[PDB]
Structures are given as C-alpha cells and as structure tokens.
mmCIF file of C-alpha atoms in Angstrom:
data_model
loop_
_atom_site.group_PDB
_atom_site.id
_atom_site.type_symbol
_atom_site.label_atom_id
_atom_site.label_comp_id
_atom_site.label_asym_id
_atom_site.label_seq_id
_atom_site.Cartn_x
_atom_site.Cartn_y
_atom_site.Cartn_z
ATOM 1 C CA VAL A 739 4.769 8.762 25.481
ATOM 2 C CA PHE A 740 1.493 8.854 23.433
ATOM 3 C CA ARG A 741 0.787 5.551 21.560
ATOM 4 C CA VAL A 742 -1.130 6.005 18.234
ATOM 5 C CA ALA A 743 -2.283 2.818 16.399
ATOM 6 C CA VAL A 744 -3.018 2.438 12.672
ATOM 7 C CA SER A 745 -4.035 -0.670 10.708
ATOM 8 C CA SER A 746 -2.093 0.134 7.500
ATOM 9 C CA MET A 747 1.083 -1.054 5.691
ATOM 10 C CA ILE A 748 1.619 2.571 4.474
ATOM 11 C CA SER A 749 4.766 4.033 6.141
ATOM 12 C CA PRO A 750 4.376 7.412 7.927
ATOM 13 C CA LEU A 751 7.508 8.377 5.839
ATOM 14 C CA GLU A 752 5.982 7.354 2.438
ATOM 15 C CA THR A 753 6.643 10.001 -0.319
ATOM 16 C CA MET A 754 2.991 9.930 -1.617
ATOM 17 C CA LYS A 755 0.593 8.997 1.314
ATOM 18 C CA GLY A 756 3.008 9.494 4.300
ATOM 19 C CA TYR A 757 0.885 10.511 7.366
ATOM 20 C CA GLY A 758 3.917 11.540 9.525
ATOM 21 C CA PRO A 759 2.518 15.137 9.636
ATOM 22 C CA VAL A 760 -0.589 13.783 11.547
ATOM 23 C CA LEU A 761 1.775 12.353 14.221
ATOM 24 C CA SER A 762 3.748 15.677 14.320
ATOM 25 C CA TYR A 763 0.404 17.553 14.763
ATOM 26 C CA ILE A 764 -0.560 15.252 17.732
ATOM 27 C CA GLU A 765 2.943 15.867 19.299
ATOM 28 C CA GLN A 766 2.526 19.700 19.035
ATOM 29 C CA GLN A 767 -1.076 19.726 20.433
ATOM 30 C CA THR A 768 -0.562 17.096 23.245
ATOM 31 C CA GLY A 769 3.043 18.106 24.209
ATOM 32 C CA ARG A 770 3.805 14.319 24.309
ATOM 33 C CA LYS A 771 6.251 12.284 22.140
ATOM 34 C CA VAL A 772 4.099 10.164 19.726
ATOM 35 C CA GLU A 773 4.904 6.430 19.287
ATOM 36 C CA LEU A 774 3.331 4.853 16.154
ATOM 37 C CA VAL A 775 1.928 1.322 16.813
ATOM 38 C CA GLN A 776 1.486 0.061 13.213
ATOM 39 C CA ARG A 777 -0.246 -3.314 12.482
ATOM 40 C CA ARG A 778 -1.274 -5.075 9.209
ATOM 41 C CA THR A 779 -4.763 -6.149 10.482
ATOM 42 C CA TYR A 780 -7.776 -4.404 12.097
ATOM 43 C CA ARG A 781 -8.062 -7.343 14.563
ATOM 44 C CA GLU A 782 -4.551 -6.559 15.959
ATOM 45 C CA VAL A 783 -5.442 -2.848 16.511
ATOM 46 C CA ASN A 784 -8.818 -3.721 18.166
ATOM 47 C CA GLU A 785 -6.982 -6.139 20.616
ATOM 48 C CA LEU A 786 -4.575 -3.270 21.567
ATOM 49 C CA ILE A 787 -7.671 -1.030 22.231
ATOM 50 C CA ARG A 788 -9.509 -3.814 24.194
ATOM 51 C CA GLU A 789 -6.398 -4.277 26.440
ATOM 52 C CA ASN A 790 -5.823 -0.474 26.922
ATOM 53 C CA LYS A 791 -2.277 -0.762 25.394
ATOM 54 C CA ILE A 792 -2.573 2.375 23.160
ATOM 55 C CA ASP A 793 -3.923 5.916 23.718
ATOM 56 C CA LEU A 794 -5.382 6.783 20.247
ATOM 57 C CA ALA A 795 -6.327 4.643 17.176
ATOM 58 C CA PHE A 796 -7.401 5.244 13.545
ATOM 59 C CA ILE A 797 -9.900 2.325 13.081
ATOM 60 C CA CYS A 798 -12.414 1.258 10.354
ATOM 61 C CA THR A 799 -16.231 1.561 10.718
ATOM 62 C CA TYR A 800 -16.796 -2.183 11.482
ATOM 63 C CA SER A 801 -13.829 -2.109 13.975
ATOM 64 C CA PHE A 802 -15.587 0.880 15.642
ATOM 65 C CA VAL A 803 -18.885 -1.083 16.095
ATOM 66 C CA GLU A 804 -16.857 -3.705 18.133
ATOM 67 C CA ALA A 805 -14.455 -1.160 19.789
ATOM 68 C CA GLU A 806 -17.400 1.016 21.067
ATOM 69 C CA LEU A 807 -18.636 -2.044 23.093
ATOM 70 C CA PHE A 808 -15.291 -2.429 24.972
ATOM 71 C CA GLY A 809 -15.257 1.291 25.810
ATOM 72 C CA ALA A 810 -13.218 2.990 23.008
ATOM 73 C CA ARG A 811 -14.317 6.707 23.138
ATOM 74 C CA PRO A 812 -15.000 8.441 19.776
ATOM 75 C CA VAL A 813 -12.756 11.501 19.047
ATOM 76 C CA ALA A 814 -13.718 12.552 15.470
ATOM 77 C CA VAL A 815 -14.502 11.399 11.867
ATOM 78 C CA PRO A 816 -13.015 12.760 8.626
ATOM 79 C CA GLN A 817 -15.190 15.038 6.437
ATOM 80 C CA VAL A 818 -14.705 15.277 2.619
ATOM 81 C CA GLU A 819 -16.818 17.790 0.568
ATOM 82 C CA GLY A 820 -19.135 18.516 3.568
ATOM 83 C CA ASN A 821 -19.749 14.757 4.126
ATOM 84 C CA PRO A 822 -18.525 12.816 7.215
ATOM 85 C CA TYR A 823 -19.514 9.568 5.454
ATOM 86 C CA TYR A 824 -18.302 7.088 2.816
ATOM 87 C CA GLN A 825 -19.341 3.892 1.031
ATOM 88 C CA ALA A 826 -17.872 0.717 -0.450
ATOM 89 C CA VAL A 827 -17.284 1.016 -4.247
ATOM 90 C CA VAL A 828 -17.042 -2.138 -6.443
ATOM 91 C CA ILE A 829 -14.384 -1.449 -9.135
ATOM 92 C CA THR A 830 -13.668 -3.301 -12.432
ATOM 93 C CA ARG A 831 -11.526 -2.361 -15.463
ATOM 94 C CA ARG A 832 -13.496 -0.296 -18.045
ATOM 95 C CA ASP A 833 -12.138 -2.713 -20.761
ATOM 96 C CA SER A 834 -13.204 -5.885 -18.772
ATOM 97 C CA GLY A 835 -16.806 -6.089 -20.128
ATOM 98 C CA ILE A 836 -17.786 -6.482 -16.394
ATOM 99 C CA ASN A 837 -20.220 -3.554 -15.851
ATOM 100 C CA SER A 838 -22.288 -4.645 -12.771
ATOM 101 C CA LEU A 839 -21.994 -6.702 -9.535
ATOM 102 C CA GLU A 840 -24.131 -9.505 -11.147
ATOM 103 C CA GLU A 841 -21.506 -9.789 -13.999
ATOM 104 C CA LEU A 842 -18.883 -10.629 -11.266
ATOM 105 C CA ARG A 843 -20.636 -14.007 -10.537
ATOM 106 C CA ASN A 844 -17.944 -16.748 -11.037
ATOM 107 C CA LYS A 845 -15.150 -14.086 -11.313
ATOM 108 C CA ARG A 846 -12.017 -13.533 -9.166
ATOM 109 C CA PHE A 847 -12.608 -10.905 -6.435
ATOM 110 C CA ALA A 848 -10.382 -9.044 -3.919
ATOM 111 C CA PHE A 849 -11.211 -8.108 -0.291
ATOM 112 C CA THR A 850 -8.852 -6.041 1.971
ATOM 113 C CA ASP A 851 -9.345 -7.162 5.639
ATOM 114 C CA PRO A 852 -12.025 -9.540 7.115
ATOM 115 C CA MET A 853 -12.907 -6.682 9.547
ATOM 116 C CA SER A 854 -13.069 -3.944 6.781
ATOM 117 C CA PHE A 855 -16.560 -2.552 5.966
ATOM 118 C CA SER A 856 -15.640 -1.053 2.535
ATOM 119 C CA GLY A 857 -13.065 -3.850 1.870
ATOM 120 C CA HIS A 858 -15.281 -6.858 2.830
ATOM 121 C CA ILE A 859 -18.402 -6.577 5.068
ATOM 122 C CA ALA A 860 -20.408 -4.128 2.807
ATOM 123 C CA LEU A 861 -20.151 -6.628 -0.100
ATOM 124 C CA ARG A 862 -21.117 -9.579 2.197
ATOM 125 C CA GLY A 863 -24.228 -7.392 2.907
ATOM 126 C CA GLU A 864 -24.992 -6.811 -0.843
ATOM 127 C CA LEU A 865 -24.865 -10.640 -1.490
ATOM 128 C CA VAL A 866 -27.409 -11.406 1.349
ATOM 129 C CA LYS A 867 -29.946 -9.573 -0.954
ATOM 130 C CA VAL A 868 -29.552 -12.379 -3.618
ATOM 131 C CA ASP A 869 -29.180 -15.075 -0.871
ATOM 132 C CA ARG A 870 -25.458 -15.736 -1.603
ATOM 133 C CA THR A 871 -22.049 -15.567 0.135
ATOM 134 C CA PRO A 872 -18.761 -14.529 -1.537
ATOM 135 C CA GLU A 873 -17.777 -18.276 -1.534
ATOM 136 C CA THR A 874 -20.891 -19.296 -3.630
ATOM 137 C CA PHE A 875 -21.036 -16.009 -5.724
ATOM 138 C CA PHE A 876 -17.399 -15.449 -6.925
ATOM 139 C CA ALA A 877 -14.997 -18.032 -8.489
ATOM 140 C CA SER A 878 -12.422 -17.087 -5.779
ATOM 141 C CA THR A 879 -11.675 -14.430 -3.132
ATOM 142 C CA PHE A 880 -8.518 -13.086 -1.460
ATOM 143 C CA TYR A 881 -7.573 -10.624 1.352
ATOM 144 C CA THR A 882 -4.941 -8.046 0.168
ATOM 145 C CA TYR A 883 -4.905 -6.076 3.525
ATOM 146 C CA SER A 884 -4.554 -2.976 1.281
ATOM 147 C CA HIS A 885 -7.138 -0.856 -0.647
ATOM 148 C CA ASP A 886 -4.262 0.294 -2.956
ATOM 149 C CA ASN A 887 -3.107 -3.341 -3.622
ATOM 150 C CA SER A 888 -6.777 -4.285 -4.343
ATOM 151 C CA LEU A 889 -6.882 -1.380 -6.889
ATOM 152 C CA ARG A 890 -3.537 -2.554 -8.420
ATOM 153 C CA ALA A 891 -4.895 -6.186 -8.638
ATOM 154 C CA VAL A 892 -7.980 -4.967 -10.640
ATOM 155 C CA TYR A 893 -5.680 -2.740 -12.790
ATOM 156 C CA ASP A 894 -3.360 -5.750 -13.547
ATOM 157 C CA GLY A 895 -6.261 -8.209 -14.261
ATOM 158 C CA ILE A 896 -5.131 -10.389 -11.271
ATOM 159 C CA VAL A 897 -8.751 -10.130 -10.056
ATOM 160 C CA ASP A 898 -11.861 -9.128 -12.105
ATOM 161 C CA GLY A 899 -13.242 -6.913 -9.293
ATOM 162 C CA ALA A 900 -12.554 -5.454 -5.834
ATOM 163 C CA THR A 901 -14.538 -3.683 -3.078
ATOM 164 C CA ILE A 902 -12.672 -0.632 -1.710
ATOM 165 C CA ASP A 903 -12.988 2.499 0.445
ATOM 166 C CA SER A 904 -14.649 5.356 -1.578
ATOM 167 C CA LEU A 905 -12.164 7.783 0.139
ATOM 168 C CA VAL A 906 -9.075 5.713 -0.942
ATOM 169 C CA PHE A 907 -10.532 5.509 -4.504
ATOM 170 C CA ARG A 908 -10.778 9.355 -4.412
ATOM 171 C CA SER A 909 -7.195 9.805 -3.017
ATOM 172 C CA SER A 910 -5.730 7.120 -5.407
ATOM 173 C CA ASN A 911 -7.296 8.983 -8.420
ATOM 174 C CA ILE A 912 -5.527 12.249 -7.305
ATOM 175 C CA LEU A 913 -2.079 10.573 -6.652
ATOM 176 C CA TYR A 914 -2.116 7.723 -9.282
ATOM 177 C CA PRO A 915 -4.512 8.842 -12.035
ATOM 178 C CA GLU A 916 -3.214 5.923 -14.284
ATOM 179 C CA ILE A 917 -4.703 3.195 -11.987
ATOM 180 C CA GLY A 918 -8.127 4.946 -11.615
ATOM 181 C CA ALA A 919 -8.549 6.153 -15.292
ATOM 182 C CA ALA A 920 -8.718 2.452 -16.401
ATOM 183 C CA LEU A 921 -11.299 1.614 -13.683
ATOM 184 C CA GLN A 922 -15.091 2.072 -13.250
ATOM 185 C CA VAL A 923 -17.429 1.925 -10.187
ATOM 186 C CA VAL A 924 -20.060 -0.731 -11.110
ATOM 187 C CA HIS A 925 -21.762 -0.865 -7.646
ATOM 188 C CA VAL A 926 -21.844 1.143 -4.363
ATOM 189 C CA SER A 927 -22.955 0.276 -0.782
ATOM 190 C CA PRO A 928 -25.358 2.308 1.355
ATOM 191 C CA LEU A 929 -23.786 5.384 3.090
ATOM 192 C CA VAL A 930 -22.087 4.866 6.508
ATOM 193 C CA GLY A 931 -20.127 7.085 8.924
ATOM 194 C CA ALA A 932 -16.506 7.593 7.834
ATOM 195 C CA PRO A 933 -13.676 5.661 9.605
ATOM 196 C CA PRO A 934 -13.431 7.247 13.107
ATOM 197 C CA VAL A 935 -10.557 8.170 15.468
ATOM 198 C CA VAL A 936 -11.010 6.697 19.018
ATOM 199 C CA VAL A 937 -9.066 6.894 22.336
ATOM 200 C CA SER A 938 -8.477 3.816 24.567
ATOM 201 C CA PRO A 939 -11.031 2.913 27.263
ATOM 202 C CA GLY A 940 -8.371 3.993 29.884
ATOM 203 C CA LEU A 941 -7.371 7.558 28.762
ATOM 204 C CA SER A 942 -8.326 10.350 31.278
ATOM 205 C CA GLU A 943 -11.280 12.782 30.653
ATOM 206 C CA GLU A 944 -8.635 15.622 30.588
ATOM 207 C CA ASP A 945 -6.539 13.906 27.812
ATOM 208 C CA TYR A 946 -9.715 12.876 25.833
ATOM 209 C CA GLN A 947 -11.043 16.500 25.691
ATOM 210 C CA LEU A 948 -7.490 17.705 24.733
ATOM 211 C CA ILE A 949 -7.309 15.157 21.810
ATOM 212 C CA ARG A 950 -10.968 15.876 20.783
ATOM 213 C CA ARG A 951 -10.191 19.666 20.734
ATOM 214 C CA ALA A 952 -7.013 18.968 18.656
ATOM 215 C CA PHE A 953 -8.835 16.860 15.957
ATOM 216 C CA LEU A 954 -11.947 19.141 15.743
ATOM 217 C CA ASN A 955 -9.589 22.207 15.423
ATOM 218 C CA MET A 956 -7.035 20.512 13.067
ATOM 219 C CA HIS A 957 -8.305 22.531 10.003
ATOM 220 C CA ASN A 958 -7.577 25.811 11.963
ATOM 221 C CA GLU A 959 -3.842 24.987 12.686
ATOM 222 C CA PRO A 960 -1.144 25.294 9.933
ATOM 223 C CA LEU A 961 0.512 21.950 10.895
ATOM 224 C CA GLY A 962 -3.067 20.525 11.069
ATOM 225 C CA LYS A 963 -3.813 21.728 7.476
ATOM 226 C CA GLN A 964 -0.570 19.945 6.339
ATOM 227 C CA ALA A 965 -1.747 16.743 8.180
ATOM 228 C CA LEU A 966 -5.232 16.998 6.491
ATOM 229 C CA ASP A 967 -3.459 17.181 3.047
ATOM 230 C CA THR A 968 -1.551 13.872 3.813
ATOM 231 C CA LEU A 969 -4.936 12.247 4.796
ATOM 232 C CA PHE A 970 -6.785 13.734 1.709
ATOM 233 C CA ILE A 971 -9.641 15.147 3.888
ATOM 234 C CA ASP A 972 -11.059 18.650 4.589
ATOM 235 C CA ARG A 973 -11.405 18.451 8.417
ATOM 236 C CA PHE A 974 -12.437 16.255 11.377
ATOM 237 C CA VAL A 975 -16.005 16.635 12.777
ATOM 238 C CA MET A 976 -17.788 14.994 15.756
ATOM 239 C CA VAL A 977 -18.660 11.237 15.503
ATOM 240 C CA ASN A 978 -22.369 10.239 15.316
ATOM 241 C CA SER A 979 -22.533 6.544 16.475
ATOM 242 C CA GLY A 980 -25.958 6.272 14.701
ATOM 243 C CA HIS A 981 -24.099 6.684 11.327
ATOM 244 C CA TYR A 982 -22.826 3.017 11.801
ATOM 245 C CA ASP A 983 -26.340 1.463 12.286
ATOM 246 C CA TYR A 984 -26.278 -0.107 8.742
ATOM 247 C CA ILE A 985 -23.090 -2.002 9.814
ATOM 248 C CA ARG A 986 -24.827 -3.136 13.078
ATOM 249 C CA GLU A 987 -27.724 -4.311 10.790
ATOM 250 C CA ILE A 988 -25.398 -6.425 8.485
ATOM 251 C CA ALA A 989 -23.389 -7.717 11.526
ATOM 252 C CA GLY A 990 -26.672 -9.058 13.066
ATOM 253 C CA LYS A 991 -27.227 -11.060 9.776
ATOM 254 C CA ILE A 992 -23.531 -12.236 9.394
#
C-alpha cells in the first residue's frame, strides 16, 4: 500500500476539483494500491512526514522549509505557464472601496492555515515592512483552512480581505468565474517556489526515483494529462530548494 497525504478538505471525488485521477496515475506508475491520508491542517501532514507514516505528500512551501530539515525528499513542483513559482495575492471585492493593503488597516481579514505561506506567512512578512503584526494591523483575523472558503468569505462580505494562493485564485476563476469577477488583487507577495511534492524520509532510493520519474513524466502519459487537468497545472518539474529562500528569510524574522 502507498500512503499519499494531502492537507485539503477537498474530496478526491469532488465534481469540480476532485484529484482522484492523480491517485489513479500514482497507482498505474507505482503498481501499488494508493491510500489517501487526508488532513485539515498542514501541521498534521508534517507530523506524518516527520514520523515516516506516509510515503508521498503534497505540502505547502512553508511546510516544505520545515519538512526538508527532517529529511523529506523533494519529488517535483507544479509548473503553470512556464513558471514553477507562485505568490500570495491579497483579494478584496471590487465594490468594497478597499483598493490596497494599507486600506485593510482595521478591517476583517481571512487567513487559511497558520503554516500556509500564501494563506498566512507571506502577509505576516508584508506587515514586518510597516512594523506591524496582523493582530495590531487588522480589526480581526480568522483561519478558514481553505483558499476557496477565504475567497467565498471576501465574496460574501464576511471579511474585507483575504490572502490566498495565486494558483487557487487562477483555478477558482476558471471553475467559479462569479466569485472571481467581483474580486480584485490589491497586493502580491514576492515570488516563491510552487507547493512541492515530497516523499517520506524512509522511502527507498529505488521507490524515490520511480515516483520522481512518474511526476516529471506525468505530462507525457494520458492518465497523467487527465491528473494535470484536475490540478489545473501544465506539468511537474524538478524542485529548486533555493526558490524557498524568501520563506526562510521571513521565518528567521517570525
């Protein structure tokens, strides 16, 4: 059995963003039955990696900075439009009159996960530049544990702004154009490496190279092309650990 972790509340069987085809692709290329190990939080997935209780994990860029240090091996990173990188985007409603990050002072704000770069840490980094924290900058904050629920909260006026994954913003705009069309990007983070795929510290060199071959060749296999459509990405390319140095920089400055 091949244990694959995700930090996501999206079902693999979801009509719109169901990533079941990714699991089917891994089954075909490994010859192993895939077991999905789904958790709400990044912390839970990183603990499973630390304790060598899974084989393969889809983790966030901040999670990767920690996971690298307890021996998680990088497999691949998604590429969209030639770019294996992404950024945090700060989103408001176009009709809000809130047109910049400064205009979100004393407003209600949404984060995703305490360990999310694009959903939390990137914005903590922007506020260091004006010598503030979220707690002293915004009227209130909240963790949604969902980029899509953060988007829906901005759309509904529940919060005035949210920080989300540039790639989820892109995929949301394709699937749910009604949410996006009402929304504007008022601020963006610096560029960082895209969320990487890793294998556990314990997986064999044989199995690693097999999984690395499978991800880097996914765009060449018909079932792989189907899996890339469910993930809204062009292909997987090799990880460059240097592409997460901005996150290591912010981390050092809490």
